[PDB]
Amino acid sequence: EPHQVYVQILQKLTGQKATANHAAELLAKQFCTRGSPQETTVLLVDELDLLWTHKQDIMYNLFDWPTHKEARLVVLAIANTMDLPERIMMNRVSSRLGLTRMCFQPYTYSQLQQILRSRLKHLKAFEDDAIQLVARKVAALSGDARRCLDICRRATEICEFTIAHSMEAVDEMFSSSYITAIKNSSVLEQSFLRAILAEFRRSGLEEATFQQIYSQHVALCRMEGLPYPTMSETMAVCSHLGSCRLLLVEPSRNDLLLRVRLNVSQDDVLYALKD
């Protein structure tokens, strides 16, 4: 709970157990009254944006208490959004955190290469080309060291089984599996997808009822020579397709009047179905 942070800080400094409101009151009394001279308090709060409240009392107290001379409190707030003190924080506290905003830019590919070299000092295990390509992909995608380490570990694992290892890692841990899932789909599911595409081309809309899709599927099956499908079979296939989040449907109560929306781009479907 958000209000429980008052209990956590109090228990960390004195070990006392109290209610959220009483812990807040005791912390207020300690930080507003001239008590015994205590050591300077270094407070670190992680994931600030998740402490938000409609009343903004906790945030106001957190960023207002060090303003008091008697507090002897230094607070560092780590967050991901730089807009927070502007559009999330009100004016008086925004001016309190104003002009003290540190922004950490993402590592350049040179920085990533330096980090990787420091990780692998005195160890000749990777070729420079794989390292440079991995750092460059990381720079061009997110510039994150965590996924870089994951890619390096996967490359080591594949080498246990060169640039090929890094390419396999990057195109296996980043690329989407929709195309291969469509490729491994059944024949009836492919016919259903073709019927949906044909109906969409005829109409031009991105939403279609189940009845027209069923009619198009029946026409396609007649063209293909497939046996006549029942309504229950088509509904079961559609329900299975919606289960893996390839479509969008609410078939709990509506059966013949179900709106269907594609979860993937039309061109990807065409490129998967041409083969």
Partner: protein, 406 residues
């Protein structure tokens, strides 16, 4: 004789209904090898990993994990150090319940405490244990995903080794996670697809209905193997299998069909027949709507025909009771002296009964302001379905049939 039939019935019922573990694995050699290798790495060392397994429901997601655990737990005394926790998204719907289950499974309630106190630092401060998360997608729908974030954090920490395993049917599980947990999630994914052809499905069917080598009677087992092998190439059995394979490749439906086929095995017919498989397939592939229509009465049939006429004249528009009554009156008035002299209340009760069977659904539901009359109703059937059902109606009169044709 009877004892052998009872034993084989018990064994096959245990195989299908309870889904008992079996050494046979189909098209999952690489995936199982990878999963077992990573489990051994996580067990023999202090390293931590996180893996998600994606596949359609009924594709043996749990079987891979169970077989790997049975293979690797009994390797050495590591299982004594290894602890396992199983969590299902259906039973545990709240974080408090999940925490309570975690505490009770670890037998730490004495250490942590018995009361309902919300503090969890007793475990957190103290925190090799493996975690199994059934229906992992449901946990992502919690208010703050606190449990998942804490599990990922402790997996990424250097305090204790923790293995996290999740099961998901959705293919978009990556976008259901928040940015922080997605960044902290080790991108290890295994995909379970039925990547095999129809002949491989035939082989699977042949092997599944094969008696094990541990059966007491050996000559009877060999004769059963001969029977199933002979039934394998029969073109009617192949046609039924082809139909069911076109419908769906999931093994759960195949297990259900095999179970229903075995139900018709008696003393007089110890060995199956292709006609038994045909009967089972026919019973498994019937539409419910036509069955519901078949059990109606004459007045309901006339009302449905009037409804179809309304849908034809007014293309894809709602209706109420008054218009249907008026046109039924028109039909009974054109005929000279047909025996259909019925009053309003009985027709109203018939309409209420039809609405009760949920063949007709209201639009933009409201009550009090609008009565049952003058209420926008729609039909949930197709014209071809009505024609096919009326064709098989036992005693449909000529007059109503010709009205339907009109």
């Amino acid at each position: 004789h009877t004892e052998c039939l009872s034993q084989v019935q018990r064994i096959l019922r245990e195989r299908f209904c309870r889904q008992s573990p079996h050494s046979n694995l189909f098209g999952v050699q690489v995936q199982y090898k990878h999963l077992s290798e990573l489990l051994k790495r996580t067990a023999l060392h202090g390293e931590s990993n996180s893996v998600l397994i994606i596949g359609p429901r009924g594709s043996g997601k749990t079987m891979l994990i169970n077989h790997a655990l049975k293979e690797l737990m009994e390797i050495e005394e590591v299982s004594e150090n290894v602890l396992q926790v199983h969590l299902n998204g259906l039973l545990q719907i709240n974080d408090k319940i999940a925490l309570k289950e975690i505490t009770r499974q670890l037998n730490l309630e004495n250490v942590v405490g018995d009361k309902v106190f919300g503090s969890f630092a007793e475990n957190l401060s103290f925190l090799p244990v493996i975690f199994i998360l059934d229906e992992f997608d449901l946990f992502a729908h919690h208010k703050n995903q606190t449990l998942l974030y804490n599990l990922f954090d402790i997996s990424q920490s250097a305090q204790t080794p923790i293995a996290v395993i999740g099961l998901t049917c959705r293919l978009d599980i990556l976008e259901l996670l928040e940015k922080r947990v997605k960044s902290r999630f080790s991108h290890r994914q295994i995909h379970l697809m039925n990547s095999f052809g129809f002949p491989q499905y035939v082989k699977i069917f042949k092997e599944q209905l094969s008696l094990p080598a541990e059966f007491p009677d050996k000559v009877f087992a060999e004769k059963w193997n001969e029977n199933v092998q002979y039934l394998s190439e029969d073109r009617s059995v192949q046609e039924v299998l082809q139909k069911h394979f076109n419908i769906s490749k999931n093994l759960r439906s195949l297990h259900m069909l095999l179970m229903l086929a075995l139900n018709r095995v008696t003393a007089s017919h110890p060995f199956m027949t292709a006609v038994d498989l045909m009967e089972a397939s026919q019973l498994c592939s019937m539409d419910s709507k036509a069955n519901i229509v078949h059990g109606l009465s004459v007045l309901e049939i006339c009302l449905i025909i009037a409804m179809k006429h309304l849908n034809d004249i007014y293309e894809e528009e709602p209706f109420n009771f008054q218009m249907v009554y008026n046109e039924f009156q028109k039909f009974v008035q054109r005929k000279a002296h047909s025996v259909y002299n019925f009053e309003k209340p009985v027709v109203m009760k018939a309409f209420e009964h039809l609405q009760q069977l949920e063949l007709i659904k209201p639009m933009e539901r409201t009550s009090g302001n609008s009565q049952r009359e003058y209420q926008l109703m729609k039909l949930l059937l197709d014209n071809t379905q009505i024609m096919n059902a009326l064709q098989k109606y036992p005693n449909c009169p000529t007059d109503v049939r010709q009205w339907a044709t009109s």
